[PDB]
Design a protein around this ligand. Structure first.
Ligand SMILES: [Mg+2]
Length: 117
């Protein structure tokens, strides 16, 4: 079972993302803070990180920089939730905007998570 770490401070968004991912058979890890996301990523080794760029305490792009600078976390694909240019240059594999399209969201995640070795 693949694990997705969701970094989102808003309760409603966190719940939507969790529900959608769980319905696909994925397990989720959850946090509202950027620094904690880094700690959780090392402790659990998620397969993908969904990160809200507009966190209240820190920029998601700065958190992504720390991720890419860590040899054990750099390979984990990061999908930004919000730009397209900044996010790409920031190290994120894809971007999802709100109001989010359920199918676009799931297709994006699945394409990154469900590939052959
Ligand atoms: Mg936010």
């Amino acid at each position: 079972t693949k694990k997705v770490l969701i970094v989102e401070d808003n309760e409603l968004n966190m719940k939507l993302f969790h529900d959608l991912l769980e319905a696909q058979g994925y397990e989720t890890l959850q946090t509202r803070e950027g620094l904690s996301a880094l700690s959780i990523a090392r402790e659990n080794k998620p397969d993908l990180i969904l990160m809200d760029i507009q966190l209240p305490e820190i920029s998601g792009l700065e958190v992504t920089k720390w991720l890419k600078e860590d040899d054990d976390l750099a390979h984990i694909p990061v999908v930004a939730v919000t730009d397209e240019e900044r996010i790409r240059e920031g190290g994120c594999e894809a971007y999802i905007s709100k109001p989010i399209s359920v199918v676009h969201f799931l297709e994006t995640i699945k394409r990154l998570l469900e590939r052959q070795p």
